Symmetry: C2
Subunit: 112 residues, 2 copies
């Protein structure tokens, strides 16, 4: 069970960024995959449960978009109009009727 | 609306005990699974213990036999007893609740656990 977070980095305010949470070795059923970001604390940003149901933190609805490519077992997070408020380490979490909870290494996202 | 007030953190001697309390206030709208995650300084996040709502438990192999996860539905408060703390248990503990029909996710503010 391994997750590859990528697509982090620094950008100028108003800029855009797409992150990627690739999963390998999922020993179980369709997983729910979300994104928690730790800002200088922790907050649930968005998730997509597997059945296809999507949810978003209100502070990002309209600006962020979570999608998934089952064929690739990868989930993407498109973040548009990044404000200073969006700065933080972004981790993606996965859970598979299993209550298993796994995390990525996180990927830093800095906005000026 | 949904807020969690963690507490009970502090310091400790190698082998001491502590009980983390994760109080939940606000309209959750559905029974919740409560999870606990700690963060070692400089390190990332690791899944400690969990109670699914039906009453089902779960533990990080590293804490089985040392940590006890309990809940009080009435108070909508989840607890975490930590016995025989190793220095390696040191870090920031946060409780997370997921209440989804609607995968809603919420977090406490953390509570610091230090083990000399």
């Amino acid at each position: 069970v391994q997750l590859v977070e990528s697509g982090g980095g620094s950008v100028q305010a108003g800029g855009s960024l797409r992150l990627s949470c690739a999963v390998s070795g999922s020993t179980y059923s369709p997983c729910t995959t979300g994104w928690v970001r730790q800002a200088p604390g922790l907050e649930w940003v968005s998730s997509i449960s597997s059945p296809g149901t999507i949810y978003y933190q209100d502070s990002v609805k309209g600006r962020f978009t979570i999608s998934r490519d089952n064929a690739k077992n990868t989930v993407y997070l498109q973040m548009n109009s990044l404000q200073r408020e969006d700065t933080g380490m972004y981790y993606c979490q996965i859970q598979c009727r299993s209550i298993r909870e796994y995390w990525g290494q996180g990927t830093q996202v800095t906005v000026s």
